[PDB]
Amino acid sequence: SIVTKSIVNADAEARYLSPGELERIKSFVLSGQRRLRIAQTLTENREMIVKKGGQQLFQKRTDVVSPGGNAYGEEMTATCLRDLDYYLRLVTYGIVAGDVTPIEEIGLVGVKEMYNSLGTPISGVSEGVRCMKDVACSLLSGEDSAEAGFYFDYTLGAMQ
């Protein structure tokens, strides 16, 4: 969170929260309702984003669902869409947190080691999250999908 990041920041400096940091918190707690609208919309439209993002993923990338790929079969494709549902959930957590600390600690810290231990190409995961970013930007406003879309951009930057 933003509050956690500022407390950590001036904790490591062993000083009180600085005026600049305090101003940001005010801007955060006043921007609350807008964020809750965004996470509300991505909450109630999750099945379209996971389904449609998975369709654009598998249509762009016919590798992994081909015989010989990682996600070949009904069960494996279901597990693939299950993970896209995970990163969608984490993005909604990152929107209401006002920071990518939930996204990072639940999903990104040592992701490369996990998918390398699964035999999964992580570039396919990043293409999937980009597809969900395009669907979620199709479901929102201009500035709104700029904000949410940038949380998705952070997860893309962590996968690549």
Partner 1 sequence: MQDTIASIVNRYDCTGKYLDNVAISELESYFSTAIIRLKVIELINQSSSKIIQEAANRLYTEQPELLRPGGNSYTTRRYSACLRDIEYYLRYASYALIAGNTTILSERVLDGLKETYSSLNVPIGPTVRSIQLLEDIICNEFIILAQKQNISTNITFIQQPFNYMVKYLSEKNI
Partner 2 sequence: MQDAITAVINTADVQGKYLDDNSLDKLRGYFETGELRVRAAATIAANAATIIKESVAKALLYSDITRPGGNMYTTRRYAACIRDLDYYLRYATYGMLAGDPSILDERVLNGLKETYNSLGVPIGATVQAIQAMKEVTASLVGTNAGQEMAVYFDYICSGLS
Partner 3 sequence: NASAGSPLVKPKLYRTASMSAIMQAEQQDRFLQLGELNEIVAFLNSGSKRLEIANVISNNSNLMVSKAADKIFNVVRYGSTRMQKSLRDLDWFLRYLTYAIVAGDTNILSVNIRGLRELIDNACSSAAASVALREMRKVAVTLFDNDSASQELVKEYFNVIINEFDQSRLSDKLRKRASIDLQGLKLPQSYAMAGILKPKFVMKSSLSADEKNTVVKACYRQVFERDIAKAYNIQFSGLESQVKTGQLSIKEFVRALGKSSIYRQQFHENFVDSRVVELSFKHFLGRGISSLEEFQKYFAILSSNGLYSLIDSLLNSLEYSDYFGEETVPYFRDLGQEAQESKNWGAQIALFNYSAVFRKKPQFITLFSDYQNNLPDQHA
Ligand X SMILES: CCC1=C(C)/C(=C/C2=NC(=C\c3[nH]c(/C=C4\NC(=O)[C@H](C)[C@H]4CC)c(C)c3CCC(=O)O)/C(CCC(=O)O)=C2C)NC1=O
Binding region for partner 2 (CB under 8 A): 1, 3-4, 7-8, 11, 14-17, 19, 22, 25-26, 28-30, 32-33, 36, 39, 43, 46, 89, 92-93, 96-97, 102, 105-111, 113-114, 117-119, 150, 153-154, 157, 160
CB of 1 to ligand X, least distance (A): 18
CA distance 46 to 52: 10
124 binding partner (options ligand X, partner 2, partner 1, none; Cβ < 5 to 8 Å by kind): ligand X
Q: What's phi and psi for 39, nearest 5 deg?
A: -70, -25
CB of 105 to partner 1, least distance (A): 5
Cβ burial of 144 (10 Å; 0-12, 13-18, 19+) is: middle
The three-state secondary structure class of 63 is: coil
102 binding partner (options partner 3, ligand X, partner 1, none; Cβ < 5 to 8 Å by kind): partner 1
Residue nearer to ligand X on the CB measure, 86 or 150:
86
What is the CA angle 134-70-119, rounded to 5? 105
Token representation of residue 23: 């101003």
Q: Is 35 in the site for partner 3 (CB under 8 A)?
A: no
99 Rama class: left (phi>0) / alpha (psi -120 to 50) / beta:
beta
Which parts of this chain interact with ligand X (CB under 6 A)?
Answer: 64, 69-71, 76, 79-80, 83-84, 86, 106-107, 118, 120-121, 124-125, 128
